[PDB]
Amino acid sequence: ALPQTVRIGTDTTAAPFSSKDAKGEFIGFDIDLGNEMCKRMQVKCTWVASDFDALIPSLKAKKIDAIISSLSITDKRQQEIAFSDKLYAADSRLIAAKGSPIQPTLESLKGKHVGVLQGSTQEAYANDNWRTKGVDVVAYANQDLIYSDLTAGRLDAALQDEVAASEGFLKQPAGKEYAFAGPSVKDKKYFGDGTGVGLRKDDTELKAAFDKALTELRQDGTYDKMAKKYFDFNVYGD
Template sequence: MIKPFLAIGLLLGVLNTTTAVLPQVIKIGSDTSYAPYEWLDVDGTAKGFEVELTDAMCQHLGVKCVFVATDFDGLIPSLQSEKVDMLVSALAMTEKRQRQIAFSDKIFAVAPRLIAPKGADLQPTADSLRGKNVGVEQGTTQESYANAVWRNQGVNVIAYQNQHLVYEDLVAGRLDASLQDQVAGEEGFLKQEKGKDFAFTGPAINDTKYFGVGTGFGFRKGDDELREAFNQALIAIRADGTYQAIAAKYFDFDIYGG
């Protein structure tokens, strides 16, 4: 039998884990060149699927979120140096990144895929891409994969500071293909006017060694209260349908995955 004062103490302990004192302003590092997840509007305002999700979570938590545009390969350093408080940038939860930072629960899950000019018969294999120029964004899991699996097999892997530059060189004919998240490639390029002469080629790449088991928000190791607060906020917005309503604005399939 649990004594009354002990039961009250246990209850207060549970409440304390879910009502942590959070900063009133949370600075969020994000690569805003990766539509539909994050992009900058003409007025410099961050927009996108993850931006709306984060705003909904911050509203649930009663805090203000401020997005700080950061090149992808600078995200983890900016978090570790405390320039930002967390990362929201379609971050795949890979083993390598988990050694550097802590992750939230899964936010969504998608796989990467090649884009090439329409009619190009290219597959996401070293044999098919040997001698070809393939663009990737610096610091991404796509870059890690291409360097590890393709580069030493004769594929010219070219890294760019952001995704916009990858697409620019693809359109200009300086690249034979680009490798990026499938949804970002479709929504941020193929469905746009600049991508009208391009298409996916070959199947999606599913390799958990390089691409992990989904994406999450990034936190400094030890910032457990902030991380758990966003985990609880994610549970809340999925339970009340907010997550699904936001996702339906951007996707016609279940972005969360199984």
């Protein structure tokens, strides 16, 4: 049977997906999707704040019943847990000066100076596709110096998480004359097949319930209306 109340863990340091507001309520697109799905499932849902690295251990231990915390659908996680259908994309994307002809391709980037945060999935993507194929990819300890070097002209482009970059640098003053160069880069290995509700593999009824609500709230326009509160682009992706 479904839980009497579904405990959903989430990391509230992740605006505009999951944070706390001035009255201590959970807010964001993850919260909006979770709340809207639980409603269509006709099940009680309780949000549970947790560090991100605790979420999958708490789920396996049955301390919670789902995870909605921008949890990327990767094959390695798919070895230990289940996911609903995709909630939205979590892909990466190049940033460069406005007007840059740069594309996220070997052919475009060869000879260009590309920065990535050391230890990130962006660095990993950049290593296999670009660094090892002869692109000058430089890893950085701190994101602040990536952007500083970009605006200084020391880099030509930075590979960043799309939404993080869209909400951070590109809305800050220093990013005013910067834009995404080309489209997002998609790769399940490194960025997952979007994010989804994390669930225990044995909880097949719960997965079906989330997937069903999610399809209905997408088809009747609710997904698009809720996403418009935070994003001026196709956050769902393909």
